[PDB]
Nucleic acid binder design. Structure first.
Lengths: 117, 156, 148, 85, 82, 91
RNA sequence: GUAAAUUUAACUGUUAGUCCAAAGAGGAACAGCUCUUUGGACACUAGGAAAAAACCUUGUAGAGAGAGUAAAAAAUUAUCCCAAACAUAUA
């Protein structure tokens, strides 16, 4: 019968080749995830729908940020085939209160404060 | 590294080669100087500006009218300027931005002539056998702009 | 529906932005009933708002009739003869203000469809396209396969 | 074409973020600017909420790391006053 | 006169960038058509449809008239563009 | 061909175009990148435990206050006595 | 991560269907045949597969004479055939 899926954990042991392929950094691992939905919730089972309603991902191609805790990873590990997750790299530290209403996000995965229109 | 001439050893496309970069830059400097003196003297005539005002792109020239599908929060007959000009051209030369052009090289004016609401348009949804028959009337608001002038300036 | 109704092209009255702008509305004609429920929303508009509307653009002559009828209405006469009748029975303050401002902020042309969003009166600067732009010429004008 | 725009670090959709949509679309004749577009206000609000959420998550999980460190150190220190005489 | 593309079929256009790189300027003059490329001036209701069909090269169908219903729906005073 | 042409023993097998395969590969590479970025979490499970308890508790308390707060709205004398001016006059 | 769940007062309505993937039973390891189960869709919108409720892509709804994308192109040597064509110009 159709069921849920249990992914063996060996699928998540990233290799050094993977590290040098993507923007690898095993130690000092990244803090947050920026997640975007790229597929429909319809034609997909009901628990996937509920998860995609739990992680704030209602509209597609609207990015939403989340922690990198293993709980949220255990949620993403069953809607992974409907989401593109990129690290939220911060080349300069997270914004301060005065310069927070003047920040913006670049498609490379970086949050930046110097956004004068 | 040799191949006898054959119909498919070579690439059918005719392999062009680009000009030398330094001579290319000198040529570019010469032609921009030419267009600059043309603009400074007054050679040009009427001008057309491709503009990006407020939803989408309009090709605009002096004296003409443009209908925008929304209100603009402006009293009637209240002069305005349209930034975001991405092409401006005359008989002999035309300047394209990458994407836009500075607010000093191109000046596009405008005025608001009338504010209306569009004709009553109908939204009707219907489905067969389900007694699903919805009707609605929509009247979008619109404002018409007279483009007044397009002044280009020598700053290149 | 579009086919079943008239249309027009985008237009002004007298090229009404080149030299200047002239308010198109010449006249407003309010009719109100002193003692009648239907004119209630109009009555206060003659007390509160009409004075400031009259001063806020002075080129419009505003008449108010104050008959002993039961129905109101507003006639908006424009420069080019068009008359826009509007009904204000059983209305209120804010909607009558919005209506009179809408009348005094549009031209008199009929509200029927607009076919082009533009009216570029000189739609070329560089020479309109005919099939011979971008087509070469040949020696002495020989159409192909000729000899002499 | 928008795959090229992404491999050059731009919004894939020119009506996204860039010069075309961020900058104001008009200005009064004399020069004094005009109240911004409601799209600008909406997107400023959405980006503000995004930044505030990033601050919240980052600093709360850091606070959690700190609390775990001091909890382990408390375990270590109150493991040391059971070893006298 | 630069010809990566043979800019001679129609005319020649010159491309350049302003010094910084944030504007592109193209110079296109109206090339004039030469003299010596020029030439000098040189100084009955079925057959009706068939002859009009051969002279204007359209087929016969459009030339017959249309009934009253298809000629009161035609618009006498259509709007004038421009 | 017997009937309901898209099924049966003599069904017509659809062909796999090149662009469909390219789309499959695009989605699959995106999946590989997801596998990577889920392959290194910050806090081991024992560390995250209870770190955001306060925020959840206050959010749920806000929910509870919203739920408990429902009650009929007020009723003013001004409304009932301002309906009484649908008979204004001039005189 | 979420903002919903349980309980109280109150009536109506449906109460089971069809097809697709999957594990099975009966039947010919036929049937657009009958019967259980986990999931999906349909009886709701839209685009694709030729036509196409059931396959693939997509949901919250209006105006636009703006933009980026999703799925998405057939390859080997018993009235009347049935898309016209095309081995190579930078994917």
């Amino acid at each position: 019968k159709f069921t849920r899926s249990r992914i063996p954990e060996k699928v998540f042991q990233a290799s050094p080749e993977d590290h040098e392929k993507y923007g690898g950094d095993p130690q000092n691992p990244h803090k947050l995830h920026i997640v975007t939905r790229i597929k429909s919730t319809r034609r997909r089972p009901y628990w996937e729908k509920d998860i995609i309603k739990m992680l704030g991902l209602e509209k597609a191609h609207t990015p939403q940020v989340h922690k990198n805790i293993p709980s949220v990873n255990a949620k993403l590990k069953v809607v992974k085939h409907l989401i593109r997750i990129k690290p939220l790299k911060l080349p300069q530290g997270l914004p301060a209160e005065e310069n927070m209403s003047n920040t913006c996000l670049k498609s490379t995965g970086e949050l930046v404060v110097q956004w004068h229109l | 590294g040799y191949v006898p001439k054959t119909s498919l050893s070579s690439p059918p496309w005719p392999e062009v080669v680009l000009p030398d970069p330094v001579e290319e830059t000198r040529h570019h400097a010469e032609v921009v100087k030419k267009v600059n003196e043309m603009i400074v003297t007054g050679q040009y005539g009427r001008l057309f500006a491709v503009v990006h005002f407020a939803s989408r792109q309009w090709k605009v020239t002096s004296e003409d009218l443009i209908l925008i599908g929304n209100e603009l929060d402006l009293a009637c007959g209240e002069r305005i300027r349209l930034e975001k000009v991405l092409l401006v051209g005359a008989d002999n030369f035309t300047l394209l931005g990458k994407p836009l052009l500075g607010k000093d090289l191109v000046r596009v004016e405008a005025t608001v002539i009338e504010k209306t609401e569009s004709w009553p348009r109908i939204i009707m949804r219907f489905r067969k056998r389900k007694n699903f028959k919805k009707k609605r009337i929509v009247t979008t608001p619109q404002t018409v702009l007279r483009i007044n002038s397009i002044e280009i300036a020598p700053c290149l | 529906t579009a086919r079943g109704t008239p249309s027009r092209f985008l237009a002004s009255v007298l090229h009404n932005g080149l030299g200047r702008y002239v308010q198109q509305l010449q006249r407003l004609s309010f009719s109100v009933s002193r003692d009648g429920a239907s004119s209630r929303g109009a009555r206060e508009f003659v007390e509160r708002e009409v004075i400031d509307f009259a001063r806020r653009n002075p080129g419009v002559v505003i008449y108010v009739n104050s008959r002993p009828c039961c129905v109101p209405r507003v006639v908006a006469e424009y420069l080019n003869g068009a008359v826009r009748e509007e009904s204000i029975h059983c209305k209120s303050v804010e909607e009558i203000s919005t209506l009179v401002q809408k009348l005094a902020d549009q031209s008199g042309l009929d509200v029927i469809r607009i076919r082009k969003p533009f009216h570029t009166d000189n739609p070329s600067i560089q020479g309109q396209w005919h099939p011979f732009t971008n087509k070469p010429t040949t020696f002495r004008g020989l159409r192909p396969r000729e000899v002499q | 074409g928008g795959q090229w725009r992404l491999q050059q670090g731009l919004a894939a959709n020119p009506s996204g973020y860039g010069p075309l949509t961020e900058l104001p679309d008009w200005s009064y004749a004399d020069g004094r600017p005009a109240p911004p577009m409601k799209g600008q206000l909406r997107r400023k609000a959405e980006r503000e909420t995004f930044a505030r959420r990033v601050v919240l998550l980052s600093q709360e999980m850091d606070a959690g790391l700190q609390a775990w460190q001091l909890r382990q150190q408390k375990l270590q220190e109150e493991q040391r006053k059971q070893e006298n005489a | 006169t630069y010809s990566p593309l043979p800019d001679d079929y129609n005319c020649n256009v010159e491309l350049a960038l302003t010094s910084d790189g944030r504007t592109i300027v193209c110079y296109h003059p109206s090339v004039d058509i030469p003299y010596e490329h020029t030439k000098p001036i040189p100084r009955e209701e079925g057959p009706m449809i068939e002859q009009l069909s051969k002279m204007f090269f359209t087929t016969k169908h459009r030339w017959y008239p249309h009934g009253r219903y298809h000629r009161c729906r035609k618009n006498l005073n259509p709007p004038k563009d421009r | 061909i017997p009937g309901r042409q898209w099924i049966g023993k003599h069904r017509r097998p659809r062909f796999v175009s090149l662009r469909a395969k390219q789309n499959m590969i695009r989605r699959l590479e995106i999946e590989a990148e997801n596998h990577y970025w889920l392959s290194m979490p910050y806090m081991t499970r024992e560390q995250e435990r209870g770190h955001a308890a306060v925020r959840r508790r206050e959010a749920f308390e806000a929910i509870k206050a919203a739920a408990t707060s429902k009650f009929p709205p007020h009723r003013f004398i001004a409304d009932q006595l301002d309906h009484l001016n649908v008979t204004k006059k001039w005189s």
